[PDB]
Symmetry: D3
Subunit: 257 residues, 6 copies
Amino acid sequence: KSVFVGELTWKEYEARVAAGDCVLMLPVGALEQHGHHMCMNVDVLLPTAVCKRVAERIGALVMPGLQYGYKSQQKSGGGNHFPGTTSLDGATLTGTVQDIIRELARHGARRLVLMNGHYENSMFIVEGIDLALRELRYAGIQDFKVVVLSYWDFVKDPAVIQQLYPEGFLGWDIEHGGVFETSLMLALYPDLVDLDRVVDHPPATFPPYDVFPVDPARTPAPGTLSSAKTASREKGELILEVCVQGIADAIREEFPP
Amino acid sequence: KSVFVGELTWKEYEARVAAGDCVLMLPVGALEQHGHHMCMNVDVLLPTAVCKRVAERIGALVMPGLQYGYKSQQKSGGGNHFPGTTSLDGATLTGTVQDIIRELARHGARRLVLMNGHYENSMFIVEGIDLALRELRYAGIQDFKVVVLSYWDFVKDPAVIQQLYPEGFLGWDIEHGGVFETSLMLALYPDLVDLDRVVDHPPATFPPYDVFPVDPARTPAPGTLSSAKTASREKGELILEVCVQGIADAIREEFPP
Amino acid sequence: KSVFVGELTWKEYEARVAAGDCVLMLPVGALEQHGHHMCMNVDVLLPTAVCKRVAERIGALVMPGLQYGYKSQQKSGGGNHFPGTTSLDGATLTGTVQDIIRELARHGARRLVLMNGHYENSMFIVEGIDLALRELRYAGIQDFKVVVLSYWDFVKDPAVIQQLYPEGFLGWDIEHGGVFETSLMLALYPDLVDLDRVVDHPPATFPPYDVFPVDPARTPAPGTLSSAKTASREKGELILEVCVQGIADAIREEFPP
Amino acid sequence: KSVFVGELTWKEYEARVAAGDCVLMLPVGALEQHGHHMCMNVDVLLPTAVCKRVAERIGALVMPGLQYGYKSQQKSGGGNHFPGTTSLDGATLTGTVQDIIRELARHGARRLVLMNGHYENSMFIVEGIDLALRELRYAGIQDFKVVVLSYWDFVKDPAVIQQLYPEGFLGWDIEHGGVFETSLMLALYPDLVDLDRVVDHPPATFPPYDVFPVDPARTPAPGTLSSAKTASREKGELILEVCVQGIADAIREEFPP
Amino acid sequence: KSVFVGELTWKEYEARVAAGDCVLMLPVGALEQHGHHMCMNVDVLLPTAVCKRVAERIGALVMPGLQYGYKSQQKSGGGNHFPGTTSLDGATLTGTVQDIIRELARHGARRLVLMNGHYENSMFIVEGIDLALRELRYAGIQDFKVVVLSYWDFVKDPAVIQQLYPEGFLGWDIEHGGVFETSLMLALYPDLVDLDRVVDHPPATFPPYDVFPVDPARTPAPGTLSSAKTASREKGELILEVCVQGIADAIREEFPP
Amino acid sequence: KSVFVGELTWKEYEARVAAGDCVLMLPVGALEQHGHHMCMNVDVLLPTAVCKRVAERIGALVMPGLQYGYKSQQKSGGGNHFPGTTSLDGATLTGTVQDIIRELARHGARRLVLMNGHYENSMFIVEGIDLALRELRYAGIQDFKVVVLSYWDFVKDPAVIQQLYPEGFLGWDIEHGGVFETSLMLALYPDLVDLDRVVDHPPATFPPYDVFPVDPARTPAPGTLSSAKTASREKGELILEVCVQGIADAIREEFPP
Ligand SMILES: [Mn+2]
Ligand SMILES: [Mn+2]
Ligand SMILES: [Mn+2]
Ligand SMILES: [Mn+2]
Ligand SMILES: [Mn+2]
Ligand SMILES: [Mn+2]
Ligand SMILES: [Zn+2]
Ligand SMILES: [Zn+2]
Ligand SMILES: [Zn+2]
Ligand SMILES: [Zn+2]
Ligand SMILES: [Zn+2]
Ligand SMILES: [Zn+2]
C-alpha cells in the first residue's frame, strides 16, 4: 500500500486517520538552480525520497510536496538572480503551510512532520506553523503537534561527516549543489546528474554581511557553493541510511504509537 | 531530453529561453477526494500528463505542478467537508500563480500556458494572472502573454461526446470522479483506479442555489457527482488524443514559432 | 413599511431581528459596460429590484447593494479593458462580503441570501462566505446560514425559455447585455434603455481557452455578447414574475418561518 | 442627461472622459444607526444628493456611492455596538477606494472628488488615495488629482451657523443624528425622518480618551450625540444651498475648464 | 526601580503582571519633520516622557515606543513630502499595535494605555485595537481593556489654553511644531531645540478640502503649521504637569487598584 | 553633532542626504527575555550602541531602531512562551522594513545598513528588503543598495575569541543571554545587569529538529542558552572595539566616501 496520500482514496485516508495516531509528512522544497551538473527539482526530490523511506518504516503517510520555496539567498543557494530558480514570496509560502495545517486538522489529523529540503524555507515554515496553531487555538484545538526539520541536520556523526568532507565540514549553507546533494541524487536519480559537468571550484567564501541587490560576482559562476567532484553513489547510500534511520527514530520518539 | 523544467539544469533552461519563442506550461491541480475507486491526486496527474504530451509535440517545457487548489465546491467537486481534500484559501492560490509569473518574467520568459485540472481553481488563477500582469506593466513590460485553459474544454467533438455520455452531456462540473476523469486514469495510471469499487449512482442534481455551510446530504455519499461505471481505458485514449491534439493546435496558433 | 434596511431606523431593524427568523438579502452587482443601448449599473439594479419584490412577498429585508464587483471577463462581460467598467480586486470583494457577514452576525442575524447580479463575482462571494463562517466558528457561532444564488438561474423552465426565445435560445453564456438583461431593464427602468441603439451583431463565440492580456478583437465592438434586438417590456415582465416566484419559494424552503 | 455614471452607457462615459477636463465624484458613506427618528442610510444619501446637485451645476459625473464605511466610533457615530450599523474593516475600505482610483485612471480620468458623508471614513480614504497614487507613480503618472472633502466642512461659516443655530451652537463633534443631518434629511427625504420620535436628550460629553471595548453606557441610549428637536426643512434648505454652492466653487477652482 | 519594561528582567515583569492589576502603557509616535528649530523624534520623546511620569505616579509600566507612525498629512503635520519624515503604511501600524496587544494578552496583562503623540496615528491605532480585541474574543478572552488617548487632549483648562494661545486656540490639528510641542521640548530636552531658528510665519490656513498629491506650496516652507516664537520652558513645565496629572487621574479611574 | 536622525532637524538631514554619499543605519532588535540577570531590551540597545560608534567614526547617520522583532525561537532566544518577550508577526516586521526603505528612497537616500541584533529577525529583514527593492524597480530605480549584517558576525578572529573564551568557546548557537551579550551590556549599561543573579547552568543542547507547540522543558529555566558567569566589562570593551572597527571597515568598503 502506497505511503503517499495523493495515491490513496479518501476512504483509505479517512480510515488511516481514524486509527488515532496517524503521522503525516510534508516535504517542502524549491525549484532552484543546482549548477551545471544537476537538475533544478533536487530540493523537492530529496526530502520526498527521505519521507517515503521514513514513512515506509514507521507507518506514516506523505503529502504532496511543496514544489516552490522561498527566494534563493546568495550564501545558501547562489542567489535569486539565476535563471530557472522560481521562488515564492514569504507570505505565499507561509500561507500555503498555514492552509495545509488548517485542512489536516479539519480531517482529524494531529501529527505533522514538515521536512524541509531548501535551506531558505525554514523561517517561513516556522511562521506558517505559528499562525496555523494560533487559529487552531481559536477553534479550541490544542492537541495538534508539529515536528519541523531539515533532513541534513540529522547527519551529525563525526565519522560520517569525515567520509563526506575529508577536507572539513563547511556548513549546510555552503552545501548547495555540492557533495551532499549530488551524492544523494547519484544514489536516487542518477539520470538527473552528470558528474562530468561539475565545475571544480573552491568553496565559496563571503564576508560577514550581505548585500542587496544580490551581486552575481560574489557567487561562483556555475551557481554551486561547493564542488561535487567527489560525490558518489556510495556516499549517497550512506547519507540516505543515516537520515532515514535518524528521522524515523526522532518521529517515533515525538509521535509514539 | 526531458520536457520538465525541474529535470533540466539551469543552463539548459537558460538556453531554451534564450532561443526566443519558448513556451512554458504550468499544470494547476488539487488534492481532492475522487470517490471510492480513485486516488486523490487526479487533478494534478491529468493536466500534468496532458502538458507532457503537448510539450513533447510542440517543443514546450513544463513547470512543477501546483499540488493544492481552491476549496472543493459541492456542485463541482463534492464539497470541502470530505476528508483528504486539502485546499488552499483563494489568496494563497492567487499569490502562488502571481509569484510564479513574476519569476518566469524575470527569466525572460514571455509565453505561458496555465493548464487547470480542478474546476474550482479558475477564477483564482485569473486573479493571479491579472496581478502579475499589473506588476509587469509597472516595469514597462507588456509582451508577456498567458493562455489559460481547463483541458476538458477541448473535448467538443459530438462523436466523442456521444461515446462518453450516451444520455447527454450534463456539464464539466458534474464531471467529478465520473467517466471522463476515470477513463483518463485507466489509460494513464491504471494501478491508481479500481473500477470494481465504483458506486453506481444517478448523477447528482442540485437546486438553482448554493447553501453554506455545505450540507453533506446533498452530495452523493461516495463523493462522485456522476458514475464512472462505463469508464474505460479505450475512452481514456480517445480523450487523451483529442485534448493533446486540440491544445497543441491552440498553443501553436497563440504562440507561433 | 420599506423592505430596505437602509430605510429603517436601528430600532425597527433591531425589532425585526429580535423576532428570530429574519431573512436578510444582499444584492451583489457591478459597474460595467452593457453595450450602446443600456446603462452601466444594470448588475446592481436588476438583483436589487428582484430582492425588493421577493422581500415584499416573504417578509425579508434588503441590505445596501455592492455596487462594484470583480473584473469583467471577456466571455461573460466583454472584458475589463472597456471604459466605464470599474472593478475590484478579488481580495477587496471577498473582504467586503466577509466584513458584512461578520457584522450581521454581531446584530444577531443568522439567515442571509446573497443575490448575485454579475457572473464574475461568484467565486469571490464564495470565498468571502467561507472566511466569514470560519471566523464565526472561532467565536462559537455555528448557526449562521447563507444561501447564494444568481437570479437568472431561476429562469429554468423550457416553457418559459420558449416563450422568451421563439426564434431559438442560444445559451446563457452570451447573455451579457442581450435579450435577458435588456428585457428586464425595459420592464423596470425603460428610460435607461434605448433599443434603437442596439447593434444587431452575430452572437459571440470563443475558443475553449482564455488569453491575457485580453484581446479586444474577440469581443463584439459594442461590448454585448448577443443582440438585444428582440428584447421587450413583456419579456421582462415574464422574467421578473418567474424569477421572483422561484426565489421566494426557494428562500421559504431554506429559511422557513 | 443624467449626472450619474451608472446611468450612462459606456460610450457616453467614454466621450465625457475623452473631452479632457472631466470631473468624477465619488460619495463615500456608511450604513449606520441614526437614532430613533431617522433611517440608517443617511451617510450615503446626503453626500450623494450634494454630489448630484454639484455635478448638475459644474458639469461633473457621479460614481456609484460606497454604501458601507468604517467602524462607527463612540464620539462621532455612537459606536459600533449598535444593531444595524454594518461596518467594514479599514483594509477593506482602503482597498475599495484604491481599486476604484486605479480603474478610473485606466479609463483616462484624471480628476476625482471624494465626498465623505461618514466622519470615521476619512483616514481610510486618505490611505486608499495614497496607495493608488503610488501605483500610478510606478507608471510615471503624476497628473491624477484628488480632492477629498467632508460636505459639512463647507457649512462652518459663523453667519450661516448663526442662521442654523440661534440659541447657540454646541459644536460639530456632536452632530451625529442631530440638527444638521436631520434638517438635511427633512429637506431631501422627509419620508425617512419622523421628528416626533426624537429623543430629546442633553448633548453627549466625553472625557479626553477612548475606551475599548466600547462601553454602551457612555453613548446616549437612542444613539444620537445631540438632539434634533429643532431640526427643520428650512434649516435643511439653507444647509443644502450653502454646501452645494461652496463645493461647486471649490471644485471649479481646483479643476478649471 | 525603572518603570520601563525594557529595563526589567523577565522575572521582574512576570511578577508585576502576576500582581493582578498591572497597567501597561505604550507610546506611539513618529519620525517627522518639526521645522527648522526642533528635531524629528519629538512625537516619540514627548509621549514617552509623559508615560514615564504617569507610570512613576500610578505604579504602571511603559513598553518600548512605536518609533514610526502614519503618513504626515498637510493639514496636521506639514505633509509626507518632507525629507526626514519616515512614515509607515496604515496596515503596518495597525498590525504592529495588533501584534503587541496579542502578546501582552499572552503574558496575562489585561490593562493597556496607548498614548499617541502623532496626530495622524489615531485611526490606525483604533483599528489595531479592534482587530486585536476581535482575536481575543475568538480565544475566549473578554477582559482585556484598552484606554487610548492623544496626550494633548488632556490640556482642557481654558486658563492653560489661554496661557499658550492668548490670541486664541485654533486647534490641535494646526499645532505642529508650534508653541505646544516646542515648549514641552524646551522643558524636557532643551538641547534638541534652538528657538533662534524658529521661522515666525502666520499660522497656516486651509480650505475645507484636501488635495492629493500633496502640494508643497500649501504648507508653510519651514514645515511648521504655526510659529513657536512664544514657546518657553515655563509653558512646557505647565503643559507637562497638566498632562501628567490628568492622565494619571484618568487611568486611576479606568484601571483602579 | 548627533549621529541620530531623530535628533536632527529636517534641514540638517536633507543637507546630509544632499551630499550624495550619505550612509544610513537602522538597528533592528527585539523585546525579549534575557535571563534572570539582564533586562529585556538588550537586542535594541546593543546594535544601537554599535551603530552610534560606527556612525561617529565614518560620518553615517542612525535611524530610530526597530524595538520589536520576530518571535523568539527555542534554539536561539529561549522561545516565545516566556513572559515579557513581545514579538511581531513576520508580515508586520517585513512590512516595517519595507516601508522605511520606501521612505528613505523618497528622501533621496541610496545607502542603507541594517544592523540586526536579534537572530530571528534575519529572514524577515531579507523579505522586507526584497519587497522594497522590487517597488523601487517598478519606478526605474536600481541604485539603492542595502548592506545587512548581524553585529556578532564581526567577532571572527580566533585570537579575539581566545581572549574572550579562555576556557574554550562553545559556539554562537548558545549565545542568548550568555557571555557575549552580557559582557557587552557590562561595558555599556552596567546598571542593567546584575551578575549575581546569573544561573550557572550547562550549555543548552537540542536535537536536530524543532517542535511546536514549543516545549518549555527544552529551554533552561532561566531562559538563557549559556551561562554568563564569566562575563566581564573588559570582555565587553574588547567585543565593542572589534565589532565597531570591523563594521566601519566593511561599510567603507561597500559605501566609499
Ligand atoms: Mn535550495
Ligand atoms: Mn477537482
Ligand atoms: Mn456583468
Ligand atoms: Mn456616520
Ligand atoms: Mn506628528
Ligand atoms: Mn534575541
Ligand atoms: Zn538544493
Ligand atoms: Zn478531479
Ligand atoms: Zn450585466
Ligand atoms: Zn450620519
Ligand atoms: Zn509633533
Ligand atoms: Zn539577545
